[PDB]
Amino acid sequence: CNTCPEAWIYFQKKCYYFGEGAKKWIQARYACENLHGRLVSIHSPEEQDFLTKRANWRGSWIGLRDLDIEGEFIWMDNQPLDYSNWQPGEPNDAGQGENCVMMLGSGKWNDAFCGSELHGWVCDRLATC
Numbered sequence: 827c828n829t830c831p832e833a834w835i836y837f838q839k840k841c842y843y844f845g846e847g848a849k850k851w852i853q854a855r856y857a858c859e860n861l862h863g864r865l866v867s868i869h870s871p872e873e874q875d876f877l878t879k880r881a882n883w884r885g886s887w888i889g890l891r892d893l894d895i896e897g898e899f900i901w902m903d904n905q906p907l908d909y910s911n912w913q914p915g916e917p918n919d920a921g922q923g924e925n926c927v928m929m930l931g932s933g934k935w936n937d938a939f940c941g942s943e944l945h946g947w948v949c950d951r952l953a954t955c
């Protein structure tokens with residue numbers, strides 16, 4: 827079962843959407859839902875490698891946030907915190923608070939101001955048959 831909707835990209839049981847266009851994190855959440863997916867959740871080095879190689883060099887939102895309880899990150903897929911790719915020193919909750927996670931151009935993760943208008947955002951879905 828490796829079928830994905832038109833414009834999505836298949837990798838290891840999942841489908842990925844490389845969205846482009848300036849969006850705050852919440853806007854990217856709903857942009858993914860409009861396409862019947864969610865902001866991407868990442869659970870292995872192989873999945874991260876797929877994303878790193880394809881990531882927007884200006885940065886992109888992923889489906890990870892600590893809005894509800896500071897320091898408690900939650901994935902869009904509600905699965906465990908079982909794989910990380912933090913940029914060294916991140917997350918750092920800089921400014922007066924950074925509660926939404928992005929990939930840098932290198933694929934490394936950074937917590938950012940949720941109102942930042944990033945030019946990329948990545949969604950996922952399970953592949954169908």
Ligand SMILES: CO[C@H]1O[C@H](CO)[C@@H](O)[C@H](O)[C@@H]1O
Pocket residue numbers: 916918920921924936937938939
């Ligand atoms: C100063 O804030 C910026 O740079 C640091 C890293 O230096 C990040 O943690 C932060 O999210 C911002 O991108």
Ligand SMILES: [Ca+2]
Pocket residue numbers: 892896897919923924925926937
């Ligand atoms: Ca935070």
Ligand SMILES: [Ca+2]
Pocket residue numbers: 916917918919920924936937938
């Ligand atoms: Ca940060």
